[PDB]
Design a protein around this ligand. Structure first.
Ligand SMILES: [Mg+2]
Ligand SMILES: [Mg+2]
Ligand SMILES: [Mg+2]
Ligand code: NA
Ligand code: NA
Ligand code: NA
Lengths: 520, 520, 520
């Protein structure tokens, strides 16, 4: 008899002994708690494919507005919703699917090489290269002078600073500083193209929070009723407030996930986290700005502080990169996904793997499989104690209900926690203290359900029955709905035990009532 | 502002830092969780005095059947019930009081010195002394031949074994065994009187679990409707079973507290504990049997394992000895009481301090003051974690409800936990996990209320209202009773938060429903 | 086979499990680490008795200057040294004995009742009592007017303040305050005699750190070559500095132990600890000033903070009080001693038990027996981690060696740590991290050897051999001397393993060299 769910490891006294007890023959559970975010694109925007994306485990469809027109993304969103609603007939097996808009964000771009968009020049290691803001050169870039569109650049870099060009492919060092130019030396050379991205490592870039294009896209996202916004290049709390402003009163319920992308974002993370609804570790752009070997420090730091605050955190970028061209991932990639879940990430993301690669369904299925194994391999008892330690300054009543309920699910090895919530707040607090059992959240709020995918372990279930007049009956209706969903999904069966959280009265502001109930 | 309840020490990371934070200016709360057991005797058996004992804090009246006739104890028991019911006119300020019978137990006795009950002889260190079982000498004891009444004594001692006479004052070493005699050498000499008690350190004494007198006294105990029995000289599980048997069906609900008094009882504690409803550390006799400098080891081992199992443990003997003749205790005694509570004892006991001393009320009031202080000074967070770890093999549902409730009570600093229970089981499990806030247990079972004092922190409240047809109205009735009691007794005021444990339906076997609820 | 030295409990994961593993059949080691401080008086001041005192365990002879002339105390001190040196014949078994001077300190006293020393009045509760500083009534005290000798009293008390008279027997409450009188109401009444001590609970009393008598006695102590002073009624760092100043240049090596005796001493303990060489928890006076049920809080706080700092701490007063008249202690007293050793007290003390009681030597022997048992029942692994955690602000090199040495002694179950030291500092740093094995400190400084008894576990050994020319030979000589002492006293035998701390070169300044060495 080998226990399931890495429960032998769970009983260890030390982290070391916990690790020593990880058992490849210990079966995980059916429920998968880590949300999977999929970037949609040419390889996956067909209604036929999106249906398989959902059945393969996609939870959130990410629209990258770095490219594509409003008409292009509108059609993808429609297909996503068409695919999503194709399962609506059976509300027991219906998976809510959320829509996320990833903004282009502010950028620094170079000019044209010899008036051409495809021309290139070779920069040689050690050579000289003057960066200019004189627009007489914006379409006349060459190996000796390079124009770019960030006019305050000289105000935020210093002599000795570095300028990266084209996703870090080329690095320049600022030797001299002038009124509207910089004289730099070519550290790493290579081929310089046209309208390439520029990164300024260490600089406090004073670009605005949103570009003029972001404002249009954000308004588009309001029109299209997106569930969340992945805001790019967030460097300070003010940037978040500005995105909140643009979304305004009509988008006040769309969640703002700040993408941490450069040094300042990491350094000012605490205030960014406080202002945001969630966080994305944008490891791709972060690894261009900061040294690559330091990215794991930022990831673990950010996930830890997000878990501490109970705010959703996303791990993104190149998690299964090799699966763009291959149907099986490398060992480093399976490691990276598992350690992302062990770190504490609420969601893991796929970008090129699902937007353009040849095996989008295999990438989704792999992440699903790894996450379930990593979820059981967590050291829940230690994790719970340390989260409770971190938040002990708070005497919040809902936190108390969450902690007691998660504590109870540990003790009796409950099969799930059923939480009735309209806003989702009660379910969020339960997910914050990291039960191993899945949280079945019943809501009559369709958006609450879609946004639930940002929190680890929340399985949203939409109740479409009218509110019963007798509160007790209305509670039991929704509880039995969760009971049926759980049985159908294979989360538990008759005779199992679940933790049920509800409101005592219709007027209760949170789930102030907890019950241990057998599954009927 | 200086925090109350040693709550600054409560937030410490380590046991050392918790101790360093103990603050004499941090006032304890009103509620006192530790049960005070008072031996009733000439100094305290009057109705007038028994009333002041209840007001001072007595929770259990102990009748010591080492002396006294059934008539004497019957009247003592009557005066206790008379004094107790004198407050029954106010079901809100009524304090239940338990009745305990402490059996005399089996004994080893010597004979008469030179035919007189008052004669004596001097045993000299190194001299020879023959112990005989020949009844020809049972009234011819002298400094050469000593008769005693335990006839299997030769079957349980060896050459080299020690024999103790007169509560350890005299000790002998076996030098020769015979068929019905022992040749001994005097180790500790002294003056030997008649009919002194004998102790066999290290021996498995095959004396019956109960004496003829004990069987009579247990019969009397059932007739008198006693709540519990303190069973003397328990050496093995079989002994506990014989007491159980003797009590039979008629006494099946009387709690059996095994007194650990000698080496074997300590060595076989686990089986004894499993068979018993509770334990008493009978330090007095234990220190006669084993070296007095080791008693604290057994006391701490026994309390710890009782805490582990959730079974009541009583610390007894000389806790406030000097107050038999003085109105204030020594510093060793004040510290002994506080350390007994820090150890985890459910109840502390008074023997001569209340049975015959000059200041029985001051003794009770001193244990009351010390316990409250020591209770605040516990390290609840670590205690809870370690109790959870010790019982994590169990998945019992009531344990899950209790652990989640205590956990919740810690998070939101609940002023109390309210438990609705008829048998008391649900409340016993809350107490087992040692919250700092008091446990207000509402029961319609008077016996359940009296026996609740065996468990740390359970304030029993007898509901005398009639059951209501509507389960919700009956629950709400008893919950409001606990509210009114707590407000009248100063445990909490309007606006404070409490944890409320109830059965979801009339047929629920335990308190499967937990709520966080503000005090109205 | 049962493990020794509670080594099974030592392998526990939690304090609960450690507590559950304490085993009365696990034999302790021969060496006793806790120092025994004996108050010498009429019962114990003869050379013959002092010889027995030493043989039974006395490490420090305490002279209470509360009473007695310089001539009387000088003769007692002389007898201590005569008895101590009667064993000097054998330098392998010789045991240094320290001499401590405990000052009388400042006092507040009342006048005579009705012009008599032997005459009393009854203060009925609720009556009125006027305190006056008018010397007219200094010999005319009665149940209406009460004189005392503290002229500034009105400046340190308020309306509502309390005044205690005759060691807390009588409690007054200041209801009206004049410029040289106080109108009080009697709270606790009693018979008031003449020239009784007064205590001002909670007051910032401004009596001098030392009295005129204290100054003469401290000077006497310097002439008498005492090893340490017990300074009474220490309320603030400045008081310590005054005592230090009085001892002056010639007494700069005499260690100052501050006696904490009232509220201000506990609240300002930190600045007192920083300025003191050591601390005494003077529980008797402390429980007169502060409510007796709080004393254990102050004891455990003070001991924890002294351990944290590595400074000696003494637990004093009424540990075996009943043994003044009885040859065996109570269970509360045995427990009090054990728990003081478990708290972490470097030394435990006897006062009247040895100074005037009927059983001085039985008292010493009982403390010796208890300490060894309690020393084994410590949770060394947890204690070491927490001490290391508390002191991590220090990167001291000798501290590093000490921790490394204790760690090593735990790992290989070393039978002893051998430390070569002239000042004792290296041995002190080892002692503060609490090895379970004894510390044999070899010193050529006789005063170092005597003062070493202040630190848990330091067995001092005076080297009397001249200094060898070859440093390596002089080291080998002293190490071997330690080996023979350890073997002679039964600390270890050939083939056991010990940790040896030495100086690499004669001027290293501390033990910078650690070796694991088998006993030859
Ligand atoms: Mg970017
Ligand atoms: Mg007995
Ligand atoms: Mg004093
Ligand atoms: Na909610
Ligand atoms: Na129950
Ligand atoms: Na040294």
């Amino acid at each position: 008899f080998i226990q399931t769910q890495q429960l032998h490891a769970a009983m260890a006294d030390t982290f070391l002994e916990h690790m020593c007890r990880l058992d490849i023959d210990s079966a995980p559970i059916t429920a998968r708690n880590t949300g999977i975010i999929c970037t949609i694109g040419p390889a996956s925007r067909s209604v036929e494919t999106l249906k398989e994306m959902i059945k393969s485990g996609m939870n959130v469809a990410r629209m990258n507005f770095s490219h594509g027109t409003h008409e292009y993304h509108a059609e993808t969103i429609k297909n996503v919703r068409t695919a999503t609603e194709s399962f609506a007939s059976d509300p027991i097996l219906y998976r809510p699917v959320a829509v996320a808009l990833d903004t282009k964000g502010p950028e620094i771009r170079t000019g044209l090489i010899k008036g051409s968009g495809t021309a290139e020049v070779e920069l040689k290691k050690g050579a000289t290269l003057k960066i200019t803001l004189d627009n007489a050169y914006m379409e006349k870039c060459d190996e000796n002078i390079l124009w770019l569109d960030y006019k305050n650049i000289c105000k935020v870099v210093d002599v000795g600073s570095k300028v990266y060009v084209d996703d870090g492919l080329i690095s320049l060092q600022v030797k001299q500083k002038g009124p509207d130019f910089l004289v730099t030396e070519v550290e790493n050379g290579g081929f310089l193209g046209s309208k390439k991205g520029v990164n300024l490592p260490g600089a406090a870039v004073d670009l605005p929070a949103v570009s003029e294009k972001d404002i249009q896209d954000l308004k588009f996202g309001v029109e299209q009723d997106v569930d969340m916004v992945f805001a790019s290049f967030i460097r300070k709390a003010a940037d978040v407030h500005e995105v909140r402003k643009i979304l305004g009163e009509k988008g006040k319920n769309i969640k703002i996930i700040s993408k941490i992308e450069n040094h300042e974002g990491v350094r000012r993370f605490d205030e960014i986290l406080e202002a945001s609804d969630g966080i994305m570790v944008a490891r791709g752009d972060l690894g261009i700005e900061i040294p690559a070997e330091k990215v794991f420090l930022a990831q673990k730091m950010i996930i830890g502080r997000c878990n501490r605050a109970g705010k959703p955190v996303i791990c993104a970028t190149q998690m299964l990169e090799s699966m763009i061209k291959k149907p099986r991932p490398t060992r480093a990639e399976g490691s990276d996904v598992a350690n992302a879940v062990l770190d504490g990430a609420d969601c893991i993301m796929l970008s090129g793997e699902t937007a353009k690669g040849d095996y989008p369904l295999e990438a989704v299925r792999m992440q699903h499989l790894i996450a379930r194994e990593a979820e059981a391999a967590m050291f829940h008892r230690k994790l719970f104690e340390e989260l409770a330690r971190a938040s002990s300054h708070s005497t919040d009543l809902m936190e108390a209900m969450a902690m007691g309920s998660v504590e109870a699910s540990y003790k009796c090895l409950a099969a799930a926690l059923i939480v009735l919530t309209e806003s989702g707040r009660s379910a969020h607090q339960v997910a914050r203290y990291r039960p191993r059992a899945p949280i079945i959240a019943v809501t009559r709020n369709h958006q609450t359900a879609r946004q639930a995918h940002l929190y680890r372990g929340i399985f949203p279930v939409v109740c479409k029955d009218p509110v019963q007049e007798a509160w007790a009956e209305d509670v039991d209706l929704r509880v039995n709905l969760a009971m049926n969903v759980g049985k159908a999904r294979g989360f538990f069966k008759k005779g199992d035990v679940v933790i049920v959280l509800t409101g005592w009265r219709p007027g209760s502001g949170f789930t102030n009532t907890m019950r241990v109930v057998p599954v009927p």
